Amino acid sequence: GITGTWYNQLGSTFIVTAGADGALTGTYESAVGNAESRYVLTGRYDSAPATDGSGTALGWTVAWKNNYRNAHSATTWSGQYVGGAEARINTQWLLTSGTTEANAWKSTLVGHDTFTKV
Amino acid sequence: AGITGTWYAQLGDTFIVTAGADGALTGTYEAAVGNAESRYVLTGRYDSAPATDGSGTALGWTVAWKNNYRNAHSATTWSGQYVGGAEARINTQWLLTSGTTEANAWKSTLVGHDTFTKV
Amino acid sequence: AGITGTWYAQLGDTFIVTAGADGALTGTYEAAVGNAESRYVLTGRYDSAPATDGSGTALGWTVAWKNNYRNAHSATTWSGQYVGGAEARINTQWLLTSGTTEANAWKSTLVGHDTFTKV
Amino acid sequence: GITGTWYNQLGSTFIVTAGADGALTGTYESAVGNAESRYVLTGRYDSAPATDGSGTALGWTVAWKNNYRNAHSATTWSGQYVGGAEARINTQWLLTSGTTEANAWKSTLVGHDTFTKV
Ligand SMILES: O=C(CCCC[C@@H]1SC[C@@H]2NC(=O)N[C@@H]21)NCCNC(=O)c1ccc(-c2c3ccc(=O)cc-3oc3cc(O)ccc23)c(C(=O)O)c1
Ligand SMILES: O=C(CCCC[C@@H]1SC[C@@H]2NC(=O)N[C@@H]21)NCCNC(=O)c1ccc(-c2c3ccc(=O)cc-3oc3cc(O)ccc23)c(C(=O)O)c1
């Protein structure tokens, strides 16, 4: 299922628990960027997905602050769980750093992460 | 405190949110049409210790478009920053992903931008 | 005709463009500071036969940030639509990719939005 | 080099010619969506890239109109050429359809395409 420990192509670690209320909770450890150790995450997922083989929609957020470090930024991942012999979560993400109004144009990075339980 | 409250977008969407000292965002998102039928759980995070150099406050949240009235089999995430002022604002970009077949994954994700203003 | 002309964004960026009957966009993009040093080639495409139902006109263009004065080793693409009116507008979202190492590819692409208005 | 015939994970075909003026020209054939046969493309690329092993930045546009069909939309790809034993062009793209102002919120799809010469 969705619950468990996941890894992306960057080697970052995504540990998540999916509740029946549609809630996501857990921790995220980034391999790259201004991050150290684990950060809190929370999100949502569709608790009653379709049955036509479609994926299960979900999303979550990490604010890159912990007791170790503060990168003044947040990332949201938006994607879906796909079932199969090899289960994976495909996402696209938006990473926004706090900026002055003059610098807002360079506030937001975009990318794509594919997660697996390897 | 600054983030905590009710906010509205231009298209008519509203949300109410509470920002905890632990960096948690929790509340409810309501779509353009004002009814209970269009109220959904909102959950996210924020920088509880933003910089002091004039920068905005980074944040993000998620709404899965399922409630006790309906299920659209999708979710939206907003990633942006809070900008304080006499008229405070939250400037975001968002990603809406719907459940799809692997074959239709390429058309699974919409992207847009929303600016919210505080009541 | 409607697209053909000079356009300006809020941050001060301007571009001049010509729309050919073949669906080609060609012109020059100038960054916020008004000098020759900041003028770059613009190239793109557009729907020369848009729908008649009130929809906007789909378009897109690219600027590689290299000219005879400087090279930032990057490129931006704008994808949006033209909206005719007394005050015509082009509403876009854009992607700016810089050349990176495979290791830094994850931080290679910025995303944003710009609305241009016609002079 | 960049010039040549390329294919993405969707099986779509990307035939491109890179000029020394920084210009891109060619044709694109989509495997998916409201497309038939070939459509014109044009774009730009950095003609004098760095030497530190960094990729070469580029972008291009396709308006989904030809003599066969009109999908009232346009796609722009933004990414970079990466050199190696297996050369590829990694992109992210924005696909905007013409819409009413009320429907602009659902005007723009986003995704990622990886191209190779296979
Ligand atoms: O450090 C963090 C938190 C860790 C994020 C980990 C991510 S979340 C998604 C992904 N998945 C995962 O598991 N880990 C990563 N975030 C904030 C830091 N932001 C950047 O590193 C950043 C942002 C913007 C730029 C940036 C720029 C920064 C400043 C400037 O003046 C111009 C810039 O121009 C750019 C142009 C581009 O095409 C791309 C980026 C920039 C740069 C940079 O170039 O070093 C870096
Ligand atoms: O047909 C074309 C031209 C071919 C594009 C080929 C692409 S270019 C990038 C990629 N790479 C490549 O080689 N080929 C593809 N484009 C315009 C058509 N757009 C769509 O197919 C489209 C756009 C939006 C929606 C859409 C919606 C459409 C209508 C509506 O009322 C609500 C919609 O909600 C959505 C929610 C989502 O999360 C995702 C999509 C939608 C849908 C759909 O659901 O069928 C479909």
Side-chain angles (χ1 to χ4, degrees), chain C residues 47-48 56 73 79 81 97 100, chain D residues 46 55 65 72 78 80 96 99:
Chain C
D47 186 4
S48 53
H73 295 129
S79 182
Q81 59 179 317
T97 310
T100 59
Chain D
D46 179 19
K65 177 183 172 199
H72 298 308
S78 181
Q80 60 175 323
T96 307
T99 63

Side-chain angles (χ1 to χ4, degrees), chain C residues 87-108:
Chain C
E87 211 180 274
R89 293 175 193 269
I90 294 174
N91 299 313
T92 74
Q93 294 183 271
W94 54 258
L95 294 173
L96 161 67
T97 310
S98 302
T100 59
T101 61
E102 294 191 6
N104 290 340
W106 70 270
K107 56 191 297 196
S108 69

